[PDB]
Amino acid sequence: ASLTEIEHLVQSVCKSYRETCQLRLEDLLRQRSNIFSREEVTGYQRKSMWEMWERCAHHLTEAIQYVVEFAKRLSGFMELCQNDQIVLLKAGAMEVVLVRMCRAYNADNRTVFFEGKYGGMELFRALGCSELISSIFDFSHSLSALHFSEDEIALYTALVLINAHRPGLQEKRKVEQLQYNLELAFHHHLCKTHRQSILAKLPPKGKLRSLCSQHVERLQIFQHLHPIVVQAAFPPLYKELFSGGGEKHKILHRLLQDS
Ligand SMILES: CCn1c2ccc(OC3CCCCC3)cc2c2cc(C(=O)NCc3ccc(S(=O)(=O)CC)cc3)ccc21
């Protein structure tokens, strides 16, 4: 590419992101005073473990559905082969959601927007995965310290998704080229906005892997405790991405095909 082409890529990525925001940033900020009461927190803590897992997996799956749309609108992604589209989304969809979630995190009081209000990590105690929860809160806290603009989130999440090192890619060089173009776009935009200082403060790629690994591991524990709950009440797309062996569901293929 060249300079105007790189700047065009920047604009295209930012537009794809804006169109596939689940929630506009301003909607999340306007809600920060709306905080769960102590009685409401208690109510969440008294929910059964399987009911809380089901609700959280539903919310995560809704978020992932917007990430799938983001990928479908992202320059170059639909030009990859379908094997590689699926490899990239299966490895990266959760990672993208985890980065996007920092927009819903309020570092002032350490709360996150959940089911219409802001609550702290004690809200999630019924899940019984306190280590995973605190890791996600800590990750969101780290990212909130950088004060990402929406444009920076768009360009950074594009690179989280377009990762040429994912095992299983059949056209690795094509993904490498797309990743390099997106890296240029991201770094060009940071240079233009005098924001290259954040490069050194971004999380290592092993950090996002660690969160996704913890999630899959806590899911395997839960699925052993409540196998029928997962079969009967978890979202099909969630099971295709995360459970074993749940990829007998072929939702992603359908999502990628239908316009
Ligand atoms: C870290 C605490 N936390 C969670 C902790 C665990 C958990 O699920 C566990 C592991 C995975 C599934 C089964 C059990 C699930 C959540 C969880 C879900 C939400 C949520 O969706 N809020 C609504 C919303 C809507 C849009 C945006 S957005 O910024 O516009 C785009 C992203 C953000 C937020 C918020 C916090 C959460």
Side-chain angles (χ1 to χ4, degrees), residues 22-23 28 53 56-57 59-60 63 94 97 100-101 103-104 112-115 124 127 129 132-133 136-137 215 238:
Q22 189 174 352
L23 294 186
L28 287 165
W53 267 83
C56 290
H59 299 315
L60 178 69
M94 177 65 74
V97 172
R100 291 176 157 213
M101 289 207 357
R103 300 160 79 243
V112 70
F113 187 64
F114 181 80
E115 290 188 349
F124 300 91
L127 290 172
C129 50
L132 174 56
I133 301 302
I136 299 174
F137 268 74
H215 167 231
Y238 177 96

PDB file of all heavy atoms in Angstrom, residues 22-23 28 53 56-57 59-60 63 94 97 100-101 103-104 112-115 124 127 129 132-133 136-137 215 238, ligand 1:
ATOM      1  N   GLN A  22     -21.919  -2.872  19.304  1.00  0.00           N
ATOM      2  CA  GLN A  22     -23.112  -3.274  20.004  1.00  0.00           C
ATOM      3  C   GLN A  22     -23.768  -2.063  20.664  1.00  0.00           C
ATOM      4  O   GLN A  22     -24.938  -1.760  20.418  1.00  0.00           O
ATOM      5  CB  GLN A  22     -22.702  -4.330  21.008  1.00  0.00           C
ATOM      6  CG  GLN A  22     -23.789  -5.039  21.695  1.00  0.00           C
ATOM      7  CD  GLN A  22     -23.198  -6.121  22.505  1.00  0.00           C
ATOM      8  OE1 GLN A  22     -21.996  -6.388  22.392  1.00  0.00           O
ATOM      9  NE2 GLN A  22     -24.007  -6.762  23.329  1.00  0.00           N
ATOM     10  N   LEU A  23     -23.007  -1.333  21.476  1.00  0.00           N
ATOM     11  CA  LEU A  23     -23.506  -0.156  22.174  1.00  0.00           C
ATOM     12  C   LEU A  23     -22.604   1.026  21.869  1.00  0.00           C
ATOM     13  O   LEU A  23     -21.380   0.924  22.005  1.00  0.00           O
ATOM     14  CB  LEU A  23     -23.559  -0.390  23.683  1.00  0.00           C
ATOM     15  CG  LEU A  23     -24.572  -1.440  24.149  1.00  0.00           C
ATOM     16  CD1 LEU A  23     -24.634  -1.477  25.675  1.00  0.00           C
ATOM     17  CD2 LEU A  23     -25.937  -1.167  23.548  1.00  0.00           C
ATOM     18  N   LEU A  28     -23.071   4.018  26.910  1.00  0.00           N
ATOM     19  CA  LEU A  28     -22.467   3.409  28.094  1.00  0.00           C
ATOM     20  C   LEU A  28     -22.070   4.466  29.119  1.00  0.00           C
ATOM     21  O   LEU A  28     -22.212   4.257  30.328  1.00  0.00           O
ATOM     22  CB  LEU A  28     -21.233   2.587  27.698  1.00  0.00           C
ATOM     23  CG  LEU A  28     -21.491   1.256  26.978  1.00  0.00           C
ATOM     24  CD1 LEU A  28     -20.186   0.758  26.342  1.00  0.00           C
ATOM     25  CD2 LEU A  28     -22.043   0.220  27.952  1.00  0.00           C
ATOM     26  N   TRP A  53     -24.548 -18.778  34.837  1.00  0.00           N
ATOM     27  CA  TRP A  53     -23.754 -19.171  33.671  1.00  0.00           C
ATOM     28  C   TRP A  53     -24.548 -18.980  32.394  1.00  0.00           C
ATOM     29  O   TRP A  53     -24.033 -18.445  31.402  1.00  0.00           O
ATOM     30  CB  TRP A  53     -23.285 -20.622  33.795  1.00  0.00           C
ATOM     31  CG  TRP A  53     -21.940 -20.740  34.407  1.00  0.00           C
ATOM     32  CD1 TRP A  53     -21.641 -20.733  35.738  1.00  0.00           C
ATOM     33  CD2 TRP A  53     -20.695 -20.880  33.714  1.00  0.00           C
ATOM     34  NE1 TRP A  53     -20.290 -20.854  35.917  1.00  0.00           N
ATOM     35  CE2 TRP A  53     -19.683 -20.954  34.693  1.00  0.00           C
ATOM     36  CE3 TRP A  53     -20.339 -20.943  32.361  1.00  0.00           C
ATOM     37  CZ2 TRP A  53     -18.327 -21.075  34.367  1.00  0.00           C
ATOM     38  CZ3 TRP A  53     -19.000 -21.077  32.033  1.00  0.00           C
ATOM     39  CH2 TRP A  53     -18.006 -21.153  33.040  1.00  0.00           C
ATOM     40  N   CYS A  56     -24.851 -15.225  31.576  1.00  0.00           N
ATOM     41  CA  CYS A  56     -23.591 -14.665  31.101  1.00  0.00           C
ATOM     42  C   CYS A  56     -23.216 -15.211  29.726  1.00  0.00           C
ATOM     43  O   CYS A  56     -22.722 -14.461  28.882  1.00  0.00           O
ATOM     44  CB  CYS A  56     -22.484 -14.924  32.116  1.00  0.00           C
ATOM     45  SG  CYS A  56     -22.762 -13.918  33.610  1.00  0.00           S
ATOM     46  N   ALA A  57     -23.449 -16.500  29.470  1.00  0.00           N
ATOM     47  CA  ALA A  57     -23.124 -17.039  28.146  1.00  0.00           C
ATOM     48  C   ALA A  57     -24.017 -16.430  27.066  1.00  0.00           C
ATOM     49  O   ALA A  57     -23.569 -16.197  25.933  1.00  0.00           O
ATOM     50  CB  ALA A  57     -23.240 -18.570  28.149  1.00  0.00           C
ATOM     51  N   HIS A  59     -25.205 -13.299  27.187  1.00  0.00           N
ATOM     52  CA  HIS A  59     -24.710 -11.946  26.933  1.00  0.00           C
ATOM     53  C   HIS A  59     -23.418 -11.986  26.122  1.00  0.00           C
ATOM     54  O   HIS A  59     -23.209 -11.162  25.216  1.00  0.00           O
ATOM     55  CB  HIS A  59     -24.494 -11.199  28.252  1.00  0.00           C
ATOM     56  CG  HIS A  59     -25.745 -11.031  29.062  1.00  0.00           C
ATOM     57  ND1 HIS A  59     -26.944 -10.640  28.506  1.00  0.00           N
ATOM     58  CD2 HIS A  59     -25.987 -11.224  30.382  1.00  0.00           C
ATOM     59  CE1 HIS A  59     -27.869 -10.589  29.450  1.00  0.00           C
ATOM     60  NE2 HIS A  59     -27.313 -10.939  30.599  1.00  0.00           N
ATOM     61  N   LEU A  60     -22.537 -12.933  26.441  1.00  0.00           N
ATOM     62  CA  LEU A  60     -21.284 -13.036  25.699  1.00  0.00           C
ATOM     63  C   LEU A  60     -21.560 -13.364  24.244  1.00  0.00           C
ATOM     64  O   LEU A  60     -20.906 -12.832  23.336  1.00  0.00           O
ATOM     65  CB  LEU A  60     -20.387 -14.097  26.331  1.00  0.00           C
ATOM     66  CG  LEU A  60     -19.050 -14.348  25.640  1.00  0.00           C
ATOM     67  CD1 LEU A  60     -18.145 -13.132  25.835  1.00  0.00           C
ATOM     68  CD2 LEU A  60     -18.395 -15.620  26.170  1.00  0.00           C
ATOM     69  N   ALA A  63     -22.617 -10.381  22.267  1.00  0.00           N
ATOM     70  CA  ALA A  63     -21.441  -9.578  21.943  1.00  0.00           C
ATOM     71  C   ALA A  63     -20.649 -10.199  20.801  1.00  0.00           C
ATOM     72  O   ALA A  63     -20.167  -9.496  19.903  1.00  0.00           O
ATOM     73  CB  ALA A  63     -20.554  -9.427  23.181  1.00  0.00           C
ATOM     74  N   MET A  94     -13.694 -14.087  21.012  1.00  0.00           N
ATOM     75  CA  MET A  94     -13.664 -13.818  22.444  1.00  0.00           C
ATOM     76  C   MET A  94     -12.633 -12.752  22.784  1.00  0.00           C
ATOM     77  O   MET A  94     -12.872 -11.889  23.642  1.00  0.00           O
ATOM     78  CB  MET A  94     -13.352 -15.107  23.203  1.00  0.00           C
ATOM     79  CG  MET A  94     -13.232 -14.899  24.728  1.00  0.00           C
ATOM     80  SD  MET A  94     -14.819 -14.378  25.396  1.00  0.00           S
ATOM     81  CE  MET A  94     -15.655 -15.926  25.290  1.00  0.00           C
ATOM     82  N   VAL A  97     -14.112  -9.371  21.955  1.00  0.00           N
ATOM     83  CA  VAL A  97     -15.104  -8.977  22.960  1.00  0.00           C
ATOM     84  C   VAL A  97     -14.416  -8.473  24.223  1.00  0.00           C
ATOM     85  O   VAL A  97     -14.826  -7.461  24.809  1.00  0.00           O
ATOM     86  CB  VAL A  97     -16.049 -10.152  23.286  1.00  0.00           C
ATOM     87  CG1 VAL A  97     -16.956  -9.780  24.469  1.00  0.00           C
ATOM     88  CG2 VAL A  97     -16.874 -10.522  22.072  1.00  0.00           C
ATOM     89  N   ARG A 100     -13.213  -5.035  23.577  1.00  0.00           N
ATOM     90  CA  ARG A 100     -14.342  -4.115  23.489  1.00  0.00           C
ATOM     91  C   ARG A 100     -14.943  -3.834  24.859  1.00  0.00           C
ATOM     92  O   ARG A 100     -15.457  -2.730  25.091  1.00  0.00           O
ATOM     93  CB  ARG A 100     -15.435  -4.661  22.574  1.00  0.00           C
ATOM     94  CG  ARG A 100     -15.089  -4.713  21.102  1.00  0.00           C
ATOM     95  CD  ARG A 100     -16.227  -5.355  20.329  1.00  0.00           C
ATOM     96  NE  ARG A 100     -16.203  -4.961  18.930  1.00  0.00           N
ATOM     97  CZ  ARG A 100     -17.286  -4.809  18.178  1.00  0.00           C
ATOM     98  NH1 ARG A 100     -18.501  -5.034  18.685  1.00  0.00           N
ATOM     99  NH2 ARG A 100     -17.145  -4.413  16.921  1.00  0.00           N
ATOM    100  N   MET A 101     -14.907  -4.824  25.764  1.00  0.00           N
ATOM    101  CA  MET A 101     -15.557  -4.666  27.066  1.00  0.00           C
ATOM    102  C   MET A 101     -14.970  -3.526  27.886  1.00  0.00           C
ATOM    103  O   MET A 101     -15.641  -3.038  28.803  1.00  0.00           O
ATOM    104  CB  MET A 101     -15.457  -5.948  27.896  1.00  0.00           C
ATOM    105  CG  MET A 101     -16.323  -7.090  27.389  1.00  0.00           C
ATOM    106  SD  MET A 101     -16.739  -8.181  28.760  1.00  0.00           S
ATOM    107  CE  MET A 101     -15.809  -7.378  30.077  1.00  0.00           C
ATOM    108  N   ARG A 103     -14.796  -0.592  27.185  1.00  0.00           N
ATOM    109  CA  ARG A 103     -15.686   0.554  27.019  1.00  0.00           C
ATOM    110  C   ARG A 103     -16.824   0.551  28.028  1.00  0.00           C
ATOM    111  O   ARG A 103     -17.370   1.617  28.349  1.00  0.00           O
ATOM    112  CB  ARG A 103     -16.289   0.565  25.625  1.00  0.00           C
ATOM    113  CG  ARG A 103     -15.286   0.655  24.501  1.00  0.00           C
ATOM    114  CD  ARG A 103     -15.952   0.165  23.245  1.00  0.00           C
ATOM    115  NE  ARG A 103     -16.830   1.149  22.607  1.00  0.00           N
ATOM    116  CZ  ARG A 103     -18.141   0.998  22.445  1.00  0.00           C
ATOM    117  NH1 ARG A 103     -18.754  -0.085  22.909  1.00  0.00           N
ATOM    118  NH2 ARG A 103     -18.835   1.931  21.800  1.00  0.00           N
ATOM    119  N   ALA A 104     -17.223  -0.628  28.503  1.00  0.00           N
ATOM    120  CA  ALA A 104     -18.305  -0.771  29.465  1.00  0.00           C
ATOM    121  C   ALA A 104     -17.795  -0.826  30.894  1.00  0.00           C
ATOM    122  O   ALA A 104     -18.585  -1.048  31.817  1.00  0.00           O
ATOM    123  CB  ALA A 104     -19.130  -2.023  29.138  1.00  0.00           C
ATOM    124  N   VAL A 112     -18.816  -2.534  35.933  1.00  0.00           N
ATOM    125  CA  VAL A 112     -18.997  -2.845  34.525  1.00  0.00           C
ATOM    126  C   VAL A 112     -20.489  -2.840  34.235  1.00  0.00           C
ATOM    127  O   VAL A 112     -21.295  -3.220  35.092  1.00  0.00           O
ATOM    128  CB  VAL A 112     -18.347  -4.206  34.166  1.00  0.00           C
ATOM    129  CG1 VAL A 112     -19.127  -5.357  34.798  1.00  0.00           C
ATOM    130  CG2 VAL A 112     -18.214  -4.376  32.648  1.00  0.00           C
ATOM    131  N   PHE A 113     -20.850  -2.385  33.037  1.00  0.00           N
ATOM    132  CA  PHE A 113     -22.246  -2.347  32.612  1.00  0.00           C
ATOM    133  C   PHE A 113     -22.720  -3.772  32.357  1.00  0.00           C
ATOM    134  O   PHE A 113     -22.135  -4.478  31.532  1.00  0.00           O
ATOM    135  CB  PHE A 113     -22.381  -1.494  31.353  1.00  0.00           C
ATOM    136  CG  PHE A 113     -23.805  -1.247  30.926  1.00  0.00           C
ATOM    137  CD1 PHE A 113     -24.673  -0.530  31.738  1.00  0.00           C
ATOM    138  CD2 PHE A 113     -24.271  -1.721  29.705  1.00  0.00           C
ATOM    139  CE1 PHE A 113     -25.986  -0.299  31.339  1.00  0.00           C
ATOM    140  CE2 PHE A 113     -25.582  -1.491  29.300  1.00  0.00           C
ATOM    141  CZ  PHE A 113     -26.441  -0.780  30.130  1.00  0.00           C
ATOM    142  N   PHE A 114     -23.767  -4.201  33.068  1.00  0.00           N
ATOM    143  CA  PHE A 114     -24.255  -5.576  32.965  1.00  0.00           C
ATOM    144  C   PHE A 114     -25.760  -5.559  33.171  1.00  0.00           C
ATOM    145  O   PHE A 114     -26.227  -5.137  34.233  1.00  0.00           O
ATOM    146  CB  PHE A 114     -23.587  -6.474  34.003  1.00  0.00           C
ATOM    147  CG  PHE A 114     -24.027  -7.923  33.942  1.00  0.00           C
ATOM    148  CD1 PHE A 114     -23.485  -8.787  32.998  1.00  0.00           C
ATOM    149  CD2 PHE A 114     -24.975  -8.419  34.830  1.00  0.00           C
ATOM    150  CE1 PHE A 114     -23.873 -10.143  32.939  1.00  0.00           C
ATOM    151  CE2 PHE A 114     -25.382  -9.767  34.769  1.00  0.00           C
ATOM    152  CZ  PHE A 114     -24.825 -10.625  33.823  1.00  0.00           C
ATOM    153  N   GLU A 115     -26.512  -6.010  32.174  1.00  0.00           N
ATOM    154  CA  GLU A 115     -27.970  -6.122  32.308  1.00  0.00           C
ATOM    155  C   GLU A 115     -28.577  -4.815  32.814  1.00  0.00           C
ATOM    156  O   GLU A 115     -29.375  -4.784  33.757  1.00  0.00           O
ATOM    157  CB  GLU A 115     -28.348  -7.293  33.214  1.00  0.00           C
ATOM    158  CG  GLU A 115     -28.061  -8.639  32.548  1.00  0.00           C
ATOM    159  CD  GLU A 115     -28.598  -9.834  33.318  1.00  0.00           C
ATOM    160  OE1 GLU A 115     -29.026  -9.670  34.492  1.00  0.00           O
ATOM    161  OE2 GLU A 115     -28.593 -10.950  32.737  1.00  0.00           O
ATOM    162  N   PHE A 124     -20.767 -11.137  40.239  1.00  0.00           N
ATOM    163  CA  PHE A 124     -20.579 -12.366  39.474  1.00  0.00           C
ATOM    164  C   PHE A 124     -20.204 -13.553  40.352  1.00  0.00           C
ATOM    165  O   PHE A 124     -19.812 -14.604  39.829  1.00  0.00           O
ATOM    166  CB  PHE A 124     -19.514 -12.135  38.398  1.00  0.00           C
ATOM    167  CG  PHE A 124     -19.878 -11.040  37.434  1.00  0.00           C
ATOM    168  CD1 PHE A 124     -19.500  -9.726  37.675  1.00  0.00           C
ATOM    169  CD2 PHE A 124     -20.647 -11.319  36.307  1.00  0.00           C
ATOM    170  CE1 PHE A 124     -19.857  -8.716  36.792  1.00  0.00           C
ATOM    171  CE2 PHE A 124     -21.010 -10.313  35.432  1.00  0.00           C
ATOM    172  CZ  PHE A 124     -20.617  -9.011  35.676  1.00  0.00           C
ATOM    173  N   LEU A 127     -21.110 -17.336  39.782  1.00  0.00           N
ATOM    174  CA  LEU A 127     -20.494 -18.128  38.717  1.00  0.00           C
ATOM    175  C   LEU A 127     -19.501 -19.145  39.260  1.00  0.00           C
ATOM    176  O   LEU A 127     -19.288 -20.196  38.639  1.00  0.00           O
ATOM    177  CB  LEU A 127     -19.786 -17.216  37.715  1.00  0.00           C
ATOM    178  CG  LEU A 127     -20.682 -16.350  36.829  1.00  0.00           C
ATOM    179  CD1 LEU A 127     -19.797 -15.377  36.053  1.00  0.00           C
ATOM    180  CD2 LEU A 127     -21.518 -17.209  35.890  1.00  0.00           C
ATOM    181  N   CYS A 129     -16.180 -18.648  39.365  1.00  0.00           N
ATOM    182  CA  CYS A 129     -14.895 -18.581  38.670  1.00  0.00           C
ATOM    183  C   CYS A 129     -14.261 -17.230  38.989  1.00  0.00           C
ATOM    184  O   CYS A 129     -14.037 -16.380  38.135  1.00  0.00           O
ATOM    185  CB  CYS A 129     -15.069 -18.832  37.173  1.00  0.00           C
ATOM    186  SG  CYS A 129     -16.355 -17.852  36.394  1.00  0.00           S
ATOM    187  N   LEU A 132     -11.088 -16.105  37.033  1.00  0.00           N
ATOM    188  CA  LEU A 132     -11.392 -15.602  35.696  1.00  0.00           C
ATOM    189  C   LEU A 132     -12.011 -14.213  35.752  1.00  0.00           C
ATOM    190  O   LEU A 132     -11.617 -13.312  34.994  1.00  0.00           O
ATOM    191  CB  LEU A 132     -12.326 -16.575  34.986  1.00  0.00           C
ATOM    192  CG  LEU A 132     -12.863 -16.125  33.623  1.00  0.00           C
ATOM    193  CD1 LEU A 132     -11.696 -15.777  32.668  1.00  0.00           C
ATOM    194  CD2 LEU A 132     -13.762 -17.218  33.036  1.00  0.00           C
ATOM    195  N   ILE A 133     -12.997 -14.021  36.632  1.00  0.00           N
ATOM    196  CA  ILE A 133     -13.657 -12.724  36.739  1.00  0.00           C
ATOM    197  C   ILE A 133     -12.648 -11.637  37.102  1.00  0.00           C
ATOM    198  O   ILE A 133     -12.619 -10.566  36.495  1.00  0.00           O
ATOM    199  CB  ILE A 133     -14.798 -12.771  37.773  1.00  0.00           C
ATOM    200  CG1 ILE A 133     -15.854 -13.821  37.398  1.00  0.00           C
ATOM    201  CG2 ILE A 133     -15.405 -11.375  37.904  1.00  0.00           C
ATOM    202  CD1 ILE A 133     -16.493 -13.610  36.036  1.00  0.00           C
ATOM    203  N   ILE A 136     -10.471 -10.698  34.162  1.00  0.00           N
ATOM    204  CA  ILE A 136     -11.152  -9.854  33.185  1.00  0.00           C
ATOM    205  C   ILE A 136     -11.265  -8.429  33.709  1.00  0.00           C
ATOM    206  O   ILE A 136     -11.015  -7.461  32.978  1.00  0.00           O
ATOM    207  CB  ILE A 136     -12.539 -10.442  32.847  1.00  0.00           C
ATOM    208  CG1 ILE A 136     -12.392 -11.840  32.239  1.00  0.00           C
ATOM    209  CG2 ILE A 136     -13.315  -9.505  31.912  1.00  0.00           C
ATOM    210  CD1 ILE A 136     -13.711 -12.562  32.005  1.00  0.00           C
ATOM    211  N   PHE A 137     -11.638  -8.273  34.983  1.00  0.00           N
ATOM    212  CA  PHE A 137     -11.703  -6.930  35.559  1.00  0.00           C
ATOM    213  C   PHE A 137     -10.339  -6.247  35.509  1.00  0.00           C
ATOM    214  O   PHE A 137     -10.232  -5.076  35.133  1.00  0.00           O
ATOM    215  CB  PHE A 137     -12.221  -6.992  36.997  1.00  0.00           C
ATOM    216  CG  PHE A 137     -13.717  -6.831  37.105  1.00  0.00           C
ATOM    217  CD1 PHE A 137     -14.565  -7.853  36.733  1.00  0.00           C
ATOM    218  CD2 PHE A 137     -14.266  -5.645  37.578  1.00  0.00           C
ATOM    219  CE1 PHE A 137     -15.941  -7.704  36.828  1.00  0.00           C
ATOM    220  CE2 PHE A 137     -15.636  -5.487  37.684  1.00  0.00           C
ATOM    221  CZ  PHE A 137     -16.476  -6.519  37.304  1.00  0.00           C
ATOM    222  N   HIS A 215     -11.207 -19.061  30.346  1.00  0.00           N
ATOM    223  CA  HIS A 215     -12.630 -19.199  30.052  1.00  0.00           C
ATOM    224  C   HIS A 215     -12.967 -20.624  29.623  1.00  0.00           C
ATOM    225  O   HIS A 215     -13.898 -21.242  30.158  1.00  0.00           O
ATOM    226  CB  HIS A 215     -13.034 -18.180  28.983  1.00  0.00           C
ATOM    227  CG  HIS A 215     -14.381 -18.429  28.380  1.00  0.00           C
ATOM    228  ND1 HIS A 215     -14.585 -18.483  27.016  1.00  0.00           N
ATOM    229  CD2 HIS A 215     -15.586 -18.678  28.951  1.00  0.00           C
ATOM    230  CE1 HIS A 215     -15.863 -18.732  26.774  1.00  0.00           C
ATOM    231  NE2 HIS A 215     -16.492 -18.852  27.931  1.00  0.00           N
ATOM    232  N   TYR A 238     -22.262 -20.205  21.060  1.00  0.00           N
ATOM    233  CA  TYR A 238     -21.318 -20.303  22.169  1.00  0.00           C
ATOM    234  C   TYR A 238     -20.734 -21.708  22.247  1.00  0.00           C
ATOM    235  O   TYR A 238     -19.522 -21.886  22.394  1.00  0.00           O
ATOM    236  CB  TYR A 238     -22.023 -19.916  23.489  1.00  0.00           C
ATOM    237  CG  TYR A 238     -21.166 -20.035  24.740  1.00  0.00           C
ATOM    238  CD1 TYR A 238     -20.493 -18.927  25.263  1.00  0.00           C
ATOM    239  CD2 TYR A 238     -21.026 -21.260  25.390  1.00  0.00           C
ATOM    240  CE1 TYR A 238     -19.698 -19.046  26.406  1.00  0.00           C
ATOM    241  CE2 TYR A 238     -20.238 -21.399  26.534  1.00  0.00           C
ATOM    242  CZ  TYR A 238     -19.567 -20.285  27.034  1.00  0.00           C
ATOM    243  OH  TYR A 238     -18.784 -20.421  28.168  1.00  0.00           O
TER     244      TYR A 238
HETATM  245  C1  LIG B   1     -16.312  -8.746  33.414  1.00  0.00           C
HETATM  246  C2  LIG B   1     -17.671  -9.038  34.004  1.00  0.00           C
HETATM  247  N1  LIG B   1     -18.504  -9.665  33.021  1.00  0.00           N
HETATM  248  C3  LIG B   1     -18.611 -11.008  32.775  1.00  0.00           C
HETATM  249  C4  LIG B   1     -17.983 -12.086  33.388  1.00  0.00           C
HETATM  250  C5  LIG B   1     -18.227 -13.371  32.988  1.00  0.00           C
HETATM  251  C6  LIG B   1     -19.132 -13.633  31.969  1.00  0.00           C
HETATM  252  O1  LIG B   1     -19.441 -14.909  31.533  1.00  0.00           O
HETATM  253  C7  LIG B   1     -18.744 -16.009  32.102  1.00  0.00           C
HETATM  254  C8  LIG B   1     -17.584 -16.319  31.172  1.00  0.00           C
HETATM  255  C9  LIG B   1     -18.132 -16.367  29.743  1.00  0.00           C
HETATM  256  C10 LIG B   1     -19.556 -16.918  29.627  1.00  0.00           C
HETATM  257  C11 LIG B   1     -20.020 -17.790  30.801  1.00  0.00           C
HETATM  258  C12 LIG B   1     -19.611 -17.253  32.191  1.00  0.00           C
HETATM  259  C13 LIG B   1     -19.769 -12.563  31.349  1.00  0.00           C
HETATM  260  C14 LIG B   1     -19.516 -11.277  31.735  1.00  0.00           C
HETATM  261  C15 LIG B   1     -19.943  -9.928  31.386  1.00  0.00           C
HETATM  262  C16 LIG B   1     -20.883  -9.620  30.370  1.00  0.00           C
HETATM  263  C17 LIG B   1     -21.113  -8.252  30.250  1.00  0.00           C
HETATM  264  C18 LIG B   1     -22.076  -7.685  29.199  1.00  0.00           C
HETATM  265  O2  LIG B   1     -22.355  -8.275  28.205  1.00  0.00           O
HETATM  266  N2  LIG B   1     -22.612  -6.372  29.421  1.00  0.00           N
HETATM  267  C19 LIG B   1     -23.500  -5.743  28.454  1.00  0.00           C
HETATM  268  C20 LIG B   1     -22.618  -5.072  27.430  1.00  0.00           C
HETATM  269  C21 LIG B   1     -23.128  -4.727  26.203  1.00  0.00           C
HETATM  270  C22 LIG B   1     -22.323  -4.124  25.262  1.00  0.00           C
HETATM  271  C23 LIG B   1     -21.000  -3.875  25.570  1.00  0.00           C
HETATM  272  S1  LIG B   1     -19.957  -3.107  24.347  1.00  0.00           S
HETATM  273  O3  LIG B   1     -18.828  -2.412  24.997  1.00  0.00           O
HETATM  274  O4  LIG B   1     -20.721  -2.144  23.580  1.00  0.00           O
HETATM  275  C24 LIG B   1     -19.328  -4.395  23.210  1.00  0.00           C
HETATM  276  C25 LIG B   1     -18.676  -5.543  24.041  1.00  0.00           C
HETATM  277  C26 LIG B   1     -20.474  -4.205  26.800  1.00  0.00           C
HETATM  278  C27 LIG B   1     -21.278  -4.806  27.731  1.00  0.00           C
HETATM  279  C28 LIG B   1     -20.430  -7.300  31.091  1.00  0.00           C
HETATM  280  C29 LIG B   1     -19.515  -7.686  32.078  1.00  0.00           C
HETATM  281  C30 LIG B   1     -19.343  -9.077  32.132  1.00  0.00           C
END
